[PDB]
Amino acid sequence: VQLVESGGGLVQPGGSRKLSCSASGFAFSSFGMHWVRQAPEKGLEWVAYISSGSGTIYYADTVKGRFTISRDDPKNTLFLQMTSLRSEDTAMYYCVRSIYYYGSSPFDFWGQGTTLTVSAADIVMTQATSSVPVTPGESVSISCRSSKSLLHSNGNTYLYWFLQRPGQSPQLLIYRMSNLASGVPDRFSGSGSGTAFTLTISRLEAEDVGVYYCMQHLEYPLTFGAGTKLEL
Amino acid sequence: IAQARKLVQQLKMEANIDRIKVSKAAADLMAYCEAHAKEDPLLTPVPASQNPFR
Amino acid sequence: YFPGQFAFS
Amino acid sequence: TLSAEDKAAVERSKMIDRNLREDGEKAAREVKLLLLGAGESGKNTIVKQMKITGIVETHFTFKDLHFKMFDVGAQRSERKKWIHCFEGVTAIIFCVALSDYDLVNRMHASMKLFDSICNNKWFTDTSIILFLNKKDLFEEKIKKSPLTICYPEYAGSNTYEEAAAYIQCQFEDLNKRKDTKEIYTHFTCSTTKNVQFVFDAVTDVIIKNNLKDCGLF
Amino acid sequence: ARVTRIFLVVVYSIVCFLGILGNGLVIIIATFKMKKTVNMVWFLNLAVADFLFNVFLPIHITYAAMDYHWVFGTAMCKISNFLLIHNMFTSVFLLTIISSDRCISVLLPVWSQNHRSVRLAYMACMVIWVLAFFLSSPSLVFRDTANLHGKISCFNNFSLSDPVGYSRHMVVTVTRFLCGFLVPVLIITACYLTIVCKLQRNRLAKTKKPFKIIVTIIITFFLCWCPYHTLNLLELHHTAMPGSVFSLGLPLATALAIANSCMNPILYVFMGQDFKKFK
Amino acid sequence: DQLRQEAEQLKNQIRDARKACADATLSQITNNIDPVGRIQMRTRRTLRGHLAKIYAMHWGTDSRLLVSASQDGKLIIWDSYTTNKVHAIPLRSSWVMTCAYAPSGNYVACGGLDNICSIYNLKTREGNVRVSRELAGHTGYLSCCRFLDDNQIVTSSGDTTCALWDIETGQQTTTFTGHTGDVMSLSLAPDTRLFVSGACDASAKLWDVREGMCRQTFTGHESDINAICFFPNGNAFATGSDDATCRLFDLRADQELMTYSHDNIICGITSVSFSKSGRLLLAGYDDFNCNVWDALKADRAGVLAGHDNRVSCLGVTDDGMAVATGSWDSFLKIWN
Ligand SMILES: CC(C)CCC[C@@H](C)[C@H]1CC[C@H]2[C@@H]3CC=C4C[C@@H](O)CC[C@]4(C)[C@H]3CC[C@]12C
Ligand SMILES: CCCCCCCCCCCCCCCC(=O)O
Ligand SMILES: CCCCCCCCCCCCCCCC(=O)O
């Protein structure tokens, strides 16, 4: 499993740019793929999504019309044609895979990213604490809150936790607020209620330094949190 | 010859089996059936609230 | 009488 | 009334069902034949000619028609417990060795196996193609060893043609389902001639099945 | 003429009821109790085509119960007729493709196994519906109501109100007659005669069922359609031909016509093994 | 001058010991119990998608997911609550006759006329299902297969043998012999330290997984045994044969307790299963419908008649909420 993306340089405002996301190491045709951007010195936000078989396509309200998404199953490539680029599109774009069946773990793998620098009814998730200076050995809790209750009639509370190490890409820790992702150490635990969420770490080592982000998946304009840095 | 194998198989251990009365075993089966009879959705139908197959 | 009368036509 | 992740699951299920339906019609265009024999009868000879452990599957083509043949002679088990798996085969190919009427009695075992297979409750409308091998060896052996020893009730000449006709008739009058099924007897030669016989038989079977399903028959 | 009309309405109602019940039974057995074959597509499409016909028919059996007095308005007379001619002309093209498919599946057994998929049947059915709509469209343009001497009638006025309105009458009548009856009967007869010829040649039939169900399909089609179409073709010369035949012949031709949509279930689907399970 | 009369003497002694230990009957004890009322089970889900005869099925441990094997070379994993196809696995050999589900849920197993048991891994880094292992070594068709854990599996073949395999190395850890006919059914004890095998010689045998030798032998049927199941407490088991008769055997008394048969029923029995409390006994028949028996009174209490061809597989969830039946008409039905 490996996602590499290329095609991001410097584009004048109002221009057109194309991104390519090359996949090799898994069944590309069976995976729905997302595009996630992260502005410099800011949080990350959802951009677009195309399902397996190119059945359903969703765009962000701030991207709709200007951007189009397209996948190429035969050679495992994902495309993003941007038109009429603005000055607010300067960010790093990530390629994220997600497979949806009973018991799956979406948003498991993320690509490294492409830096682009243009020259010159939504559930708001709140992370009030943005900086937590803590030392290894103890336990630190990360809190989250949502305007709308994420608990659904089927019994699943769709909340995801991600860790972004310095100079790295986000990695999945907890999906649906309770289940631990594969490969994640058992020291991480998650719980909460229909509207209040928490993330607790039992033992903290030197590799836990980073930013922790929330994520909602009850409704399509998927929204991230503001992030909570955990300084050493 | 294969007759010795069968003979020793049904002599050494098969014949030396400690058996209990049929009445005791029947009573044990009936007691188990009566003890767990409450938590049987097939014996006692559950309301539509707790039934996953609505 | 007009054509189409007494029938589907 | 479905969640965001509960609709992509339905989409995946629909794609899986679409692939299942696509794969279903691809396997319905292949003729399935069940190869049977008494062992050392020439089943192997037949297999070699037509092409260019458990169960052996052989695929071939002849005039834009796909054939799958299931050799199951390497199954030392009870035939009653797995024969119903072959209920929907297009035809059976029963191989018999003519030069085994003097060795040991084997001919009577072949007749018993043919009677058991032909009168099964699963093969009441499945056609049978009977192959009789070792024709040259039968001709060589019959002129030195009379056929009357094998059949005390035989009444006729010793010549090859009469004995072959007698054997074919004795194999062909063993079916009580003379209405719904046909038997296509053929004396296998050294030549692409057996494949043509199988092709004609399966063409007749296909035409009859097509008439049966449409509604005229 | 008064005492013969009531019997006509009675027989029309009986035939319509039989057809609606029969074709409805088939639409269920072919949506639930069937498999993804190519035969079921034709049978379900024929059942749907015959079903819609019987339901809109009552409007005409009532219009006719009254002494041909229209009481539903021009735009309930400009369309309903279009919907009957569309349903009638789409169940005729489905009795042709069925015979053609049977002839292909008998005469070309190897080819028909590698090139007979469900999608082709769906495309053919869509094309059949499209051509039926094209051929049945003029009714919408020429159906109109008129008031004479206290009786009002819904008919065809090609004058859109003489040379005017005749060329239009002739072209439409000839086109409807040819495509509606001439080509379908020729194709059906040729295909079924070829099937019979190959059947007796190779002796594959162990019962008379195949030959009888076949001789039933040619004669029924011929009689109904030939009376309805010939009396229409003859109406082109109503100026010279007497009008006594039209007031009586056309009801009888219609009576023979609507009976074709009721016996199709008991001749195509009910004769198969799928209905044999229920029976 | 070898003699075999000592074997006959041993059999006579065993029969006499069994007779001397039968002071009463199970029927005479359950005469005063309240009979089970008429059981009315309705169809909730109909799982469609198989295009050929379904030959086996197995429930997941979570009582929500199930796996079904069909003769079109397909293993389909159903989410029973929503009738969604989670996975569709194409088989290398289309002649499959059994399937199994791992207790943890990471693997599935299948087998058939190819004399090979294929273990498929469901949890992979890629999004597909890969053949984790192929266990070979049986000289006959595979009849049944049950998981002990993620590493050990027990199978029975039509070569008169059973085998305990270590999946990691792919070699037969243990072999079990003694049947004189094809072994058709295999059932595991709740504690997984003993299992019962029913074969075509009209006989069932109780084995020891750790040691590896037969412990007890149960007879009484007059024809081939096609299905077998274990009582919830692990001290009894039920068998079904071709002579239209289910039977209950008790391990401690080493005898047969009750016979479940009716004069009208003359078809064989293909599947046998119990309920969560063990009071009900489900049985699938070749007369196209399944029957429910009062396991303590031998009185039929209900008929499940939603299928149109031989019922081939039958199962009950761990919590006993539903009963799944799979027939030769390519339809699985959930009854509640
Ligand atoms: C319904 C009205 C309008 C027309 C009826 C036509 C049908 C039902 C009639 C017309 C010709 C008839 C066939 C004429 C000759 C024979 C041969 C006889 O040995 C068996 C019956 C059989 C095969 C008849 C079956 C019924 C038949 C097909
Ligand atoms: C031409 C208008 C009247 C007929 C309307 C229906 C036409 C259906 C034609 C189907 C032809 C299918 C040929 C398939 C050949 C192939 O697949 O190679
Ligand atoms: C004017 C009358 C037109 C009649 C149109 C009906 C279709 C005639 C042509 C039949 C083509 C072959 C039949 C379809 C075979 C298939 O399904 O592949």
Numbering used by the authors:
A (entry chain E): 2 to 121, 137 to 248
B (entry chain G): 9 to 62
C (entry chain L): 149 to 157
D (entry chain A): 4 to 55, 182 to 233, 241 to 327, 329 to 354
E (entry chain R): 36 to 196, 210 to 327
F (entry chain B): 5 to 340
What did the published study say regarding this structure?
Chemokine-like receptor 1 (CMKLR1), also known as chemerin receptor 23 (ChemR23) or chemerin receptor 1, is a chemoattractant G protein–coupled receptor (GPCR) that responds to the adipokine chemerin and is highly expressed in innate immune cells, including macrophages and neutrophils. CMKLR1 belongs to a family of Gi-coupled chemoattractant G protein–coupled receptors (GPCRs) in the γ-subgroup of the Class A GPCRs. Cleavage of the N-terminal 20-amino acid signal peptide and the C-terminal 6-amino acid segment leads to the most active form of chemerin containing residues 21–157, which functions as the endogenous ligand to activate the chemokine-like receptor 1 (CMKLR1) or chemerin receptor 23 (ChemR23) or chemerin receptor 1. Indeed, 2 synthetic peptides, chemerin9 and chemerin15 corresponding to the 149–157 and the 141–155 amino acid segments of chemerin, respectively, have been characterized as stable agonists of CMKLR1 that induce anti-inflammatory effects.
